[PDB]
Design a protein around this ligand. Structure first.
Ligand SMILES: CN(C)c1nc2cc(Br)ccn2n1
Ligand SMILES: [Br-]
Ligand SMILES: [Mg+2]
Ligand SMILES: [Zn+2]
Length: 313
């Protein structure tokens, strides 16, 4: 009970900032996650023995793909940590517990392919779940791991608190389906501007937690330019692999995914910052003013992609 995790000074300070990079030392990522849980939640939220066993089973069930991997899991959990710490009083005990676990689990057993590719492939998971295919699988794997002997980090919740936290985690993971993001932000935009947004309305919290999840999931666009630039390589390596597999099914992939059309990437990143990222962190800043640094960092990187196009790097 008296066993804190402590990090080296540079990490101890930088981890509090939205733009923190968890680094290339895999073996430190579990301790980073626990540190965050302890400061975000308490030293008491989870039995350390069970948490550690839950973390290492979650790690095992992320695959060795270029981007949708264990590092992404922890990166996305860190962004949620930064949002929760800069918005101390807005979130219940259960939400703080549930959301860091949601973020760590959100891409469990991802194979590096989109919901579209599963459906064109006719992957079994596409028959089991017609929408938010991978996201329903990710929630399914989370529940599977939670039910391994020794792994129930929630065992000390009441029956009804347990049901609420698994419901927070399910909606949180489903919301990482970018197809659902557009409508979810449109509604939050209207609710904010007409003044009807009410954080005591459960259906409204759900929407706001969904946007937080989109923001954490996209947080690679809110890092320092060199982190953003190198992560984009990993993202495009999955896209081009998926484009290769589309060609194998006899389908010309969208250009984003065509490795013959790399030249078009900087313009494609422009489109994405403008269509998805900027609107996402704008609406999030409006709802949760202290998340402004994510918007500012996102704008800085949009500006960096504009420079790539103009031939200035
Ligand atoms: C090109 N689009 C779909 C895309 N998706 C992402 C997600 C993140 Br994080 C960063 C860049 N991109 N680029
Ligand atoms: Br990126
Ligand atoms: Mg995902
Ligand atoms: Zn993700």
């Amino acid at each position: 009970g008296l066993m804190q995790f402590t990090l080296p000074v540079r990490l101890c300070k930088e981890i509090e900032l939205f733009h923190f990079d968890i680094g290339p030392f895999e073996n430190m990522w579990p301790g980073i996650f626990v540190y965050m849980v302890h400061r975000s939640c308490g030293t008491s939220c989870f039995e350390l023995e069970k948490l550690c066993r839950f973390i290492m089973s979650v790690k095992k069930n992320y695959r060795r793909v270029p981007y949708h991997n264990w590092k992404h899991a922890v990166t996305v959990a860190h962004c949620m940590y930064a949002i929760l710490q800069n918005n101390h009083t807005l979130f219940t005990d259960l939400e703080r517990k549930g959301l860091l676990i949601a973020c760590l689990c959100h891409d469990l057993d991802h194979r590096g392919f989109s919901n579209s590719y599963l459906q064109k492939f006719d992957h079994p998971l596409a028959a089991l779940y017609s929408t938010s295919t991978m996201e329903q699988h990710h929630f399914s794997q989370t529940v599977s791991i939670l039910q391994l002997e020794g792994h129930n980090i929630f065992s000390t919740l009441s029956s009804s608190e347990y049901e609420q936290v698994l419901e927070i985690i399910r909606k949180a993971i489903i919301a990482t389906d970018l197809a659902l993001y557009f409508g979810n932000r449109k509604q939050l935009e209207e609710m904010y501007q007409t003044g009807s947004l009410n954080l005591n309305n459960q259906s409204h919290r759900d929407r706001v937690i969904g946007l937080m999840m989109t923001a954490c999931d996209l947080c690679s666009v809110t890092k320092l330019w060199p982190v953003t630039k190198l992560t984009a390589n990993d993202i495009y390596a999955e896209f081009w692999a998926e484009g290769d597999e589309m060609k194998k099914l006899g389908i010309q992939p969208i250009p984003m995914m065509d490795r013959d059309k790399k030249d078009e990437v900087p313009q494609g990143q422009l489109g994405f910052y403008n269509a998805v990222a900027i609107p996402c962190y704008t609406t999030l800043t409006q709802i949760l003013p202290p998340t402004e640094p994510l918007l500012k960092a996102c704008r800085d990187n949009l500006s960096q992609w504009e420079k790539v196009i103009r031939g200035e790097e």
